[PDB]
Design a protein around this nucleic acid. Structure first.
Ligand code: ET9
Ligand code: MG
Lengths: 553, 406
DNA sequence: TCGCCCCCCTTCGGTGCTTTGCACCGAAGGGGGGC
């Protein structure tokens, strides 16, 4: 039936009129399934016949349903969507089973044909005009418009959610101790009432939904565990994901690999240690989704590692508000991190991974800080609070970082846990120059038009060097000059540059870089014993800097 | 009452800013505050057919342990018509910065007695989130002058002058400056005789509907040069680059004779004796650094900018300017929480103090350049925010070359 | 030949700098999952 809820008024974008696009051909089965719904839709007042004063049109189709018998109708409203007003979407996120508490009695309900029970603004209906063609051209189409929310229209999901919220609110305030997770037309209902009173509350809720025109068929009224919910399986004491089947293929296309990485990311919420860095590397620099990509040896290894992880059974547990949340992070290599969130040891609420590279130049301490931030945000979304952290970094290391780094930084309450590899600073710059160490005055210059440059140095010990560089930049020659001084100095060096750029990168103590040149500098910094790094303004004739500046000229 | 016609600026649309996640305690507080507001008709429940949105959150102060709802209308204010173009804006008094002690009072609730133009309310929508996304967001829009909207002090302008008259009447040398939802009220009374007349103002405000600030100690910290009597090559290089930078701010500072003390390819730890012509240059530039710059004047038609550097041991330096290298004020903020283990707290508190000083001194907050990663700031700042206003800010990553301000 | 939401990974294009490339950032492409 159709709800007697009031319609929510909707407008076109200002200046625009409605769509006017002719219809295309569909199969015989599609016309019959569509006509059964179409004749039935008219019987139940979901649509009404129109004719030629209505100048708008849009084309229609259908698609198969996971309930294999049923067919799902869709009209191609891409044009009407473009001209329909913007909506502020109220679905802010996706509920997660790790955020559920243990409940004595659980029910899962679904509203049938939910869109088709919510009416559409009267003044807006004429823009939903369409036509049904039956075969190729035995006839042309007859014309209908929608009286209810159509599938495929930009506003339908939000007006369904708003309608569901309005209908549910009386029951919610009248039963504050009954959890209702409402996602689209899917209702999770938990409670601590014995099964007897629980089921009284359910039929009372169902009869409230039916007065407002939302029917709940028995076919989709789950009442026994395991409940199927949001792609998971809810047991009394634990939950699992529905089975994840990975592609297995002789020859892989870009599109195949994209599907695999998506599956693995989905699996990572409960399977610990999942990695996708080497599989995603294969997507880089490709040019077609149908292009065949051979797996590298590293990608085979990583795939095999993941496949071993996925053959093991796993489960999450539910949330106990009376205990702390704990987050533990491990390092996996090449900027990859994995984490578990738990309340009692070896009983994970969920897992996940962090593996983004932010910036051209970074270090493990920054990325660990980022993983912490991602986890903190995720915990707020699911549980409404942040967890306590267990991190593989020593307090000495962190304290060395936030006193020598110039940006404000922080990590909340955390306990060191010794699970190598530990997060480390891979070198430190001396705060004072080093007695007895050689002093290198470095500089490099490039010609912007020419693209040719030189890098070189002079020293307090009388050493000099000039190197010609081709196809470079200004900033590269300065980086190159520092490369040379690190290359030819001993284990202890003092260096003076006039590149704020180069000083800026290196003073942040990076340990990885998208640039092969900066990576070379990093390996050399890690091999040194002590390095002091000093800046001076250029072209002011400063002793040392001026001599080399001239030498590079 | 009849509303005042309000417009957005030509060619601008209303705000469209996502709500960020909130903790349990802030969501419960907002739900309690909004349902009471809805019952009193100050806000209305709306749906997704209103396409506008502004983030909402809550703060609770160090000594008023009830939650205050805070809606981040920065985007809405940026798009709202000027009210000095309608010339209903409020003038800043040059007396406020001269006072013994200045107390801040939150008078936001006076706005809720004035209705907002029916056609402008849609631009004020906000969305309360849901723990573990159990429900869709819940949306409201204002029916009255919103707390945090820049048009509320301007529309309520004529009325606050009426409510204030007898106080400023009776205390001609107390000065009161409205800024957004705040009254900044200063006097020269003794530390606790000042407090009692703040209570008198509260009672008069009550008859219809932070801590003590001390502007005298807002010491300016100038550029300073070290004092040694042994100076290395490296010491003189760091000093020459520092004054070379200061040559962009001050006039008649030069380096060529401190500059040639290093002639030659020297070792950075060699000890250079200072020429008398070097001491000639140095003690000279020390005294230029000693006193303020000549020719720097505030311009109210331009924005204020503020830059902050972390110095360590909980110290934080800052400069406020409008044109580069013409600082209206340089200073140094000092941590005092006691644990002294949290950079984001210190910086968030430094931004509040600097912005407070701008309101007291010039009547508006500056746009901050924050020495922090955006996503580090965003993860933690609201846990430390205690003001009913929010300044504009951006995120910068510039290493020090010079430790100019230390 | 459809809609709306979240997530990740890659790519691209705009912005601003005492720039001449570089680093940042958000949006849009692909994928996963939900109804
Ligand atoms: C979430 C939705 C409601 C509940 O989805 P649903 O699984 O409960 O389906 P519905 O209630 O209609 O039928 P049923 O409950 O009797 O089985 C449906 O109204 C429509 C919407 N939805 C779902 N998938 C699609 C889709 O691909 N394209 C479109 N445009 N919309 C879709
Ligand atoms: Mg359904």
């Amino acid at each position: 039936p159709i709800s007697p809820i009031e319609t929510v008024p909707v407008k076109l974008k200002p200046g625009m009129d409605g769509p006017k696009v002719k219809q295309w051909p569909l199969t015989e089965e599609k016309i019959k399934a569509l006509v059964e719904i179409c004749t039935e839709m008219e019987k139940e007042g979901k649509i009404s016949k129109i004719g030629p004063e209505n100048p708008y049109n849009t084309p229609v189709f259908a698609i198969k349903k996971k309930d294999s018998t049923k067919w799902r109708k869709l009209v191609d409203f891409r044009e009407l969507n473009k001209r329909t007003q913007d909506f502020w979407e109220v679905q802010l996120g996706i509920p997660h089973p790790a955020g559920l508490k243990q409940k004595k009695s659980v029910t899962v309900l679904d509203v049938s044909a939910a869109f088709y029970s919510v009416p559409l603004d009267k003044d807006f209906r004429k823009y939903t005009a369409f036509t049904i063609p039956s075969i190729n051209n035995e006839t042309p189409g007859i014309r209908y418009q929608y009286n209810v929310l159509p599938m495929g229209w930009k506003g339908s999901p939000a007006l369904l959610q708003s309608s569901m919220t309005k209908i549910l609110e009386p029951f919610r305030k009248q039963n504050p101790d009954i959890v209702i997770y409402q996602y689209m037309d899917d209702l999770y209902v938990g409670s601590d009432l014995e099964i007897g009173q629980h089921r009284t509350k359910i039929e009372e809720l169902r009869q409230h939904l039916l007065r407002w025109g939302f029917t709940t068929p028995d076919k989709k009224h789950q009442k026994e565990p395991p409940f199927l919910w949001m792609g998971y399986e809810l047991h009394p004491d634990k939950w699992t994901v529905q089975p994840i089947v990975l592609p297995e293929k002789d020859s892989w296309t870009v599109n195949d690999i994209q599907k695999l990485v998506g599956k693995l990311n989905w699996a990572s919420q409960i399977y610990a240690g999942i990695k996708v860095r080497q599989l995603s590397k294969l997507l880089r620099g490709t040019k077609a989704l149908t292009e065949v990509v051979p797996l590298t040896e590293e990608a085979e290894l990583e795939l095999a590692e993941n496949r071993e992880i996925l053959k093991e059974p796993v489960h999450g547990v539910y949330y106990d508000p009376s205990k702390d949340l704990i987050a533990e992070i491990q390092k996996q290599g090449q900027g990859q991190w994995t984490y578990q969130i738990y309340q009692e040891p070896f009983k994970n609420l969920k897992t996940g991974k962090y593996a983004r590279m932010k910036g051209a130049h970074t270090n493990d301490v920054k990325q660990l800080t980022e993983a912490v931030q991602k986890i903190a945000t995720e915990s707020i979304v699911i549980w409404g609070k942040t967890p306590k952290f267990k991190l593989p970094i020593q307090k000495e290391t962190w304290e060395a970082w936030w006193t020598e780094y110039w940006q404000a930084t922080w990590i909340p309450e955390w306990e060191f846990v010794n699970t190598p590899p530990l997060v480390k600073l891979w070198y430190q710059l001396e705060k004072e120059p080093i007695i007895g160490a050689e002093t290198f005055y470095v500089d490099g210059a490039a010609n912007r038009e020419t693209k040719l440059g030189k890098a070189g140095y002079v020293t307090d010990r009388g050493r000099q060097k000039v190197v010609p560089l081709t196809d470079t930049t200004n900033q590269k020659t300065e980086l190159q000059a520092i490369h040379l001084a690190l290359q030819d100095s001993g284990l202890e060096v003092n260096i003076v540059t006039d590149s704020q750029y180069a000083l800026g990168i290196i003073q942040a103590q990076p340990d990885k870089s998208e640039s092969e040149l900066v990576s070379q500098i990093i390996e050399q910094l890690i091999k040194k014993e002590k390095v002091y790094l000093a800046w001076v303004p250029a072209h002011k004739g400063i002793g040392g800097n001026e001599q080399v500046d001239k030498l590079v000229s | 009452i009849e509303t005042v016609p309000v417009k957005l600026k030509p060619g601008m649309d209303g705000p469209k800013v996502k709500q960020w996640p909130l903790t349990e305690e802030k969501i419960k507080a907002l739900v309690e505050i909004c349902t009471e507001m809805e019952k009193e008709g100050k806000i209305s429940k709306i749906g997704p057919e209103n396409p506008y949105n502004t983030p909402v959150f809550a703060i609770k102060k160090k000594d008023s342990t009830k939650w205050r709802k805070l809606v981040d209308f920065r985007e809405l204010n940026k798009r709202t018509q000027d009210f000095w173009e309608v010339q209903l804006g409020i003038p800043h008094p040059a007396g406020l910065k001269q006072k013994k002690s200045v107390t801040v009072l939150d008078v936001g609730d006076a706005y809720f007695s004035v209705p907002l133009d029916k056609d402008f309310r849609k631009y004020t929508a906000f969305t309360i989130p849901s723990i573990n996304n159990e429900t869709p967001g819940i949306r409201y829009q204002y029916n009255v002058l919103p707390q945090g909207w820049k048009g509320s002090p301007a529309i309520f302008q004529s009325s606050m002058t009426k409510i204030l008259e007898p106080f400023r009447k009776q205390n001609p040398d107390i000065v009161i400056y409205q800024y957004m939802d705040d009254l900044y009220v200063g006097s020269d009374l003794e530390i606790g005789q000042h407090r009692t007349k703040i209570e008198e103002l509260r009672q008069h405000l009550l008859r219809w509907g932070g801590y003590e600030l001390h502007p005298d100690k807002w010491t300016v910290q100038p550029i300073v040069l070290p004092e040694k009597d042994s100076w290395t090559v490296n010491d003189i290089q760091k000093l020459v680059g520092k004054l070379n930078w200061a040559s962009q701010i001050y006039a008649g500072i030069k380096v060529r004779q401190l500059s040639k003390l290093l002639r030659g390819t020297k070792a950075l730890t060699e000890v250079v004796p200072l020429t008398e012509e070097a001491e000639l240059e140095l003690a000279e530039n020390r005294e230029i650094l000693k006193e303020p710059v000549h020719g720097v004047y505030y311009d109210p038609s331009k924005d204020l900018i503020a830059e902050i550097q972390k110095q360590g041991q909980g110290q934080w330096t800052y400069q406020i300017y409008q044109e580069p290298f013409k600082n209206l004020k340089t200073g140094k903020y000092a941590r005092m929480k006691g644990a002294h283990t949290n950079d984001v707290k210190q910086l968030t508190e430094a931004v509040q103090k600097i912005a407070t000083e701008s309101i007291v001194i010039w009547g508006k907050t500056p746009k901050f350049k924050l020495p922090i990663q955006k996503e580090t700031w965003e993860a933690w700042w609201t846990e430390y925010w205690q003001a009913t206003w929010i300044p504009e800010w951006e995120f910068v990553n510039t290493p020090p070359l010079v430790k100019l301000w230390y």
